[PDB]
C-alpha cells in the first residue's frame, strides 16, 4: 500500500533488489535503505491507527 | 544466431526477481569495460571470444537476458543498473 515502492515485492524487503534498496551500492549504504524502510513503515501506523 | 559454448559450471549467481520479471547480478567495471571493448571492432559480446580471460560473466549475462526480459545488471564505476535492452548495445554511458 502507501509504504510500497511500485516495483517491489509488496511484503518483503530484499537486500538484493535495487528497487527495494533505492539503488544502493555497497553494504554501507544498502543498510540505510532498510533504515528508511523502517521509518516509512512506522508512519503508516500513525495513518491507520490514528 | 549461434549458441555460446558452455564453459563448464560455476556460473555466477543470478538473483531471480519475478516481481517485474527481472534479475540482478553484480558484474563489475572490468566486464562493463571489456564488453565496451567488445562492441567497438564489429565484434560480439553475447557469444564471441570463447577463450576470454573474462568469458564467464559474459556467458551468464547472455543466458540471463534470455531467461529474464528486463535484467538489472549493475556495474561498479558508477553502480548503475542498466536494463536488458540497455545492456543490448554494450555501450553504457560514454567513451570510445
Curated annotation (Swiss-Prot), chain A:
PTM description: A proteolytic cleavage by the prohead core protein protease gives rise to the mature major capsid protein during virus maturation.
Family assignment from sequence similarity: Belongs to the Tevenvirinae major capsid protein family.
SUBUNIT field: Homohexamer. Interacts with the portal protein. Interacts with the capsid vertex protein that forms pentamers. Interacts with hoc; one hoc molecule associates with each capsid hexamer. Interacts with soc; this interaction reinforces the capsid structure. A total of 960 subunits of the major capsid protein forms the 160 hexamers.
Role this protein plays: Major capsid protein that self-associates to form hexamers, building most of the capsid in association with pentons made of the capsid vertex protein and one dodecamer of the portal protein. The major capsid protein self-associates to form 160 hexamers, building most of the T=13 laevo capsid. Folding of major capsid protein requires the assistance of two chaperones, the host chaperone groL acting with the phage encoded gp23-specific chaperone, gp31. The capsid also contains two nonessential outer capsid proteins, Hoc and Soc, which decorate the capsid surface.
Name the record gives this protein: Major capsid protein
Species of provenance: Enterobacteria phage T4
Species classification: Viruses, Duplodnaviria, Heunggongvirae, Uroviricota, Caudoviricetes
Amino acid at each position: 500500500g502507501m509504504t510500497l515502492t511500485p516495483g517491489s515485492k509488496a511484503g518483503v524487503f530484499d537486500f538484493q533488489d535495487p528497487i527495494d534498496i533505492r539503488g544502493a551500492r555497497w553494504a554501507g549504504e544498502s543498510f540505510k535503505a532498510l533504515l528508511f524502510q523502517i521509518d516509512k513503515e512506522a508512519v503508516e501506523i500513525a495513518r491507520q491507527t490514528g | 544466431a549461434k549458441v555460446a559454448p558452455e564453459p563448464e559450471g560455476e556460473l555466477p549467481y543470478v538473483h531471480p526477481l519475478p516481481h517485474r520479471s527481472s534479475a540482478y547480478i553484480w558484474c563489475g567495471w572490468w566486464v562493463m569495460d571489456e564488453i565496451q571493448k567488445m562492441t567497438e571492432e564489429g565484434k560480439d559480446w553475447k557469444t564471441d571470444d570463447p577463450d576470454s580471460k573474462y568469458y564467464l560473466h559474459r556467458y551468464t549475462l547472455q543466458k540471463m537476458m534470455k531467461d529474464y526480459p528486463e535484467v538489472d545488471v549493475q556495474e561498479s564505476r558508477n553502480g548503475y543498473i542498466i536494463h536488458k535492452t540497455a545492456l543490448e548495445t554494450g555501450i553504457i554511458y560514454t567513451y570510445p
